[PDB]
Symmetry: C4
Subunit: 254 residues, 4 copies
């Protein structure tokens, strides 16, 4: 039932963001010690749990880029395309809100302690608690390239791991392995754009931050070209390229 | 045999606290390097081991909140409800005592080194070695909300992971995955209330600390409203809400 | 064939020490960043690998305390008892030697840099690279208690994990889980005595350190009562107590 | 089809280097916090993913030393030997290039910030981002010994883990376990030579660094004897010794 699938996608994506934005809020406003690998592994395992919870129902896309790619390469009913995306983005929105609710006091106290004007350019750092932003040394096109390449690897490997005709089937290991993949991607490329590779994961929370007092910098990141466009279309282009790559270079030889 | 189940629950919950309070004592009074994720993963894996050890006998509840929820939603014999809880809380008590025994010298030396009067408000930090306390910036109601939300996610996901009708069965992976779930919960929400989500895990050791010279602050946390009430009823309310949520939003669509 | 089993035990125990003493040498004389959990997880996974390699042949005891316990409670041929132990201790000896060989230069340079006289009381720290020593604040009897309690938990849980009549069988997961158990034990109790819980793991390398210029302090640890006696008999007493505990409190109710 | 196998090997080895060189670039020029175990576990899991992706096709050698050893001890068609190696080294080359592309700006900014002349002896540190180099305190022969011993353990354990006649078969766990093995090897021996143990993994990226402005020091490491020769032939000699060791000391007794 399509209604039960949209619900799962809503809970899955939200669950996913709950852990991700949560551990990052603890790092930013709670003074918790986290390394590049810790933040990555937590994001990865969060997604792994999000999958185990919703896989049996919606198939656990929990990613607009993934939904679109499966539609164009995995025979995924297009009628279910938009419903999924609207659910995925909605869950990411609510999750970010919920995480903000539990960390409410820590955000305000932190900003007062370090004289941070929420909404200003200098506040983009705490805004990074919800969505991704470009590294200081790279630009729009560079950031678009990174998100594209990584999402391709994500989609490409997801298919490989889920492809039962590829080596010994992983069975119940697939979800966990997909989480570890996300872990290593965020540890090797994270410093560049925050390994968004999920339109819903970035736009949803971004919209929340925008409402939560961060204003326009939540979308722009304090740059000339509105940054939100990168985590929005970058993952999509990559998810397709990656999906195509697997089918040709690997699938065709199985 | 109910007697053999209460024993398992006693050993399981104790084993669980042994690792948890143990790694936290090493962090607090042993000067060991631990990050928010390390402490969380150790707690998670400790519970994972506690499950593998007692699952085959008592079903491995090792959590009053869980026992009650299974009673109201998993057809768990109510006659076994109180016996379990009394065993779970007892094990947590003994474990905390045992951990204190092995770390005896380190506690006293630490307090002398940093002029800490055990029992005073400033000693709540070392008291945190046994039970959970609220973050400085949040209050009673806020702390109750956090514990409630997380325990709901705990119960909700536990059912999902153990639900054989939900995607590929995890089999022997279930326990480990439940531990990783606890890991990501403590890393994303830990800084707020110490992710207690287990009445026995918090009250048992709390009672020990109270006897061990920490006095009343072990229960109050140095606040107006006795804090021990949050980790006591907060998890219970959440465990039910979570259990209900899974049955409706997910189970009903499987 | 008993000869092929002693070889496996020799390679297993050695492999085990290779990773353990290796990561600890990198921490002590290589300036590598390791936390209490990292060192523990590396020791745990090293043992996990040591098991996968020798389990199919010798049964992978890789621990004198374990061999003795299996003899008294798992119907392990006593004729194979001494042969195993002599092999296990021999492997630990060679491994420690090999690790010292690869880290040769780093040890001498470190000692010169920090004016450390190998063999003196202050050199026990680098001697800790091979075997375990008591925490500054605890004494002989305290250290004996710690090693005893933990080894009991080790043996107790090993049986539980390997007991196919206890919940869902772990199959190929058993070894890994036994490694994670060792990981959480070393993270919760490590700071006290270095979680030796393996006579061969401590005595073998200790004898090497003694020959490598560390002298008598390698055995005494710079204390009144020769410390080597704790990691020697402490684990044995615990391995038995633990083995007994499982059979009674858990096995008898399966 | 040999063409489809060379492609897999090209993608596998590249994928492998993508994560490895990637996380190390984040550590060196992105200021990311990584410990000796984190870098090791990321390298290990990267290889684990590289295997799951290509195992079903090429058998996932992803290592010249491994290919040669399987040829001499696993009945691996020699006709496929060179094709594999040329593919493996090519993938490592491209991967290193790709990683450099995404981190382009960070490298130049870092060098300017810390006045580092790319190509000079002091630039070997950033060159370490792509290939391995010897620890300051050890020499050519010492470095050759280390790489040899570890690669032997790698090959030896790989066979053990993949040997279905050795204890309970690991099935879909094999790849992950091989990654964890690489993890513990890099954490115990890493500080000595960067646990290359893969001719393609070191030479490929080394050639890239050489073209990328690092010049001759990329091959020499700033030493008398050209260092690149160690990660080139060291792993090969060890891979054979290790392969032989397993067949004799373990295989012969199964
Ligand atoms: C789930 C529905 C959530 C709707 C958005 C709630 C956002 C609450 O966020 C609030 O936004 C205000 C407006 O900028 C700010 O002034 C406050 O500081 C901020 O707390
Ligand atoms: C499913 C996601 C669809 C996204 C469509 C584009 C939404 C763009 O969002 C817009 O960005 C502008 C630029 O900063 C802001 O000025 C506007 O307030 C904001 O609404
Ligand atoms: C398993 C049974 C344990 C019973 C409780 C033992 C507590 C020992 O704890 C002791 O408590 C004393 C009283 O406050 C303090 O004065 C001591 O400092 C403290 O070590
Ligand atoms: C199963 C757990 C039941 C718990 C029932 C409530 C126990 C409350 O405990 C009480 O808290 C008071 C307030 O700090 C203290 O003054 C008392 O000494 C203490 O006994
Ligand atoms: C595998 C067989 C190994 C035998 C022991 C070799 C120990 C080498 O160790 C050496 O011991 C000497 C004697 O104290 C010291 O003077 C040297 O500094 C030390 O390197
Ligand atoms: C299988 C292990 C058997 C160990 C038997 C006891 C070995 C004790 O070892 C002895 O310890 C003494 C005290 O420091 C030293 O003076 C001696 O040199 C040393 O040989
Ligand atoms: C995939 C094909 C890649 C071919 C090699 C590209 C190397 C680009 O690297 C460039 O090399 C130049 C020459 O040293 C340097 O001057 C530049 O600083 C460096 O960016
Ligand atoms: C498959 C790998 C084959 C490697 C063959 C040896 C390549 C050596 O490479 C050479 O090293 C010299 C010494 O620094 C440099 O001067 C040369 O520029 C370089 O081409």
């Amino acid at each position: 039932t399509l209604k039960g699938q949209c619900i799962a996608e809503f809970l899955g994506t939200g669950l996913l963001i709950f852990f991700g934005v949560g551990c990052v809020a603890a790092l930013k406003v709670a003074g918790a010690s986290f390394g590049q690998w810790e933040i990555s592994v937590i994001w990865g395992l969060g997604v792994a749990m999000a999958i185990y919870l919703t896989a049996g129902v919606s198939g656990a896309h929990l990613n607009p880029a993934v939904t679109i790619a499966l539609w164009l390469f995995a025979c995924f009913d297009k009628r279910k395309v938009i419903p999924f995306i609207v659910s995925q983005v909605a869950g990411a929105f609510c999750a970010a809100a919920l995480v903000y609710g539990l960390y409410y006091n820590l955000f305000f106290d932190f900003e007062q302690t370090h004289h941070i004007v929420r909404g200003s350019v200098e506040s983009v750092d705490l805004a990074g608690t919800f969505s991704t932003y470009p590294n200081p040394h790279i630009n729009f096109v560079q950031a678009f390239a990174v998100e594209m390449v990584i999402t391709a690897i994500l989609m490409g490997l997801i298919l490989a791991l889920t492809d039962d005709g590829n080596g010994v089937p992983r069975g119940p290991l697939a979800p966990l392995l997909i989480g570890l993949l996300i872990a290593v991607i965020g540890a090797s490329m994270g410093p560049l754009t925050g390994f968004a590779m999920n339109p819903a994961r970035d736009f949803g929370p971004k919209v929340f931050a925008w409402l939560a007092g961060w204003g326009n910098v939540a979308f722009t990141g304090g740059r000339d070209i509105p940054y939100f466009l990168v985590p929005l279309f970058g993952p999509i282009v990559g998810a397709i390229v990656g999906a195509f790559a697997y089918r040709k270079l690997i699938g065709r030889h199985l």
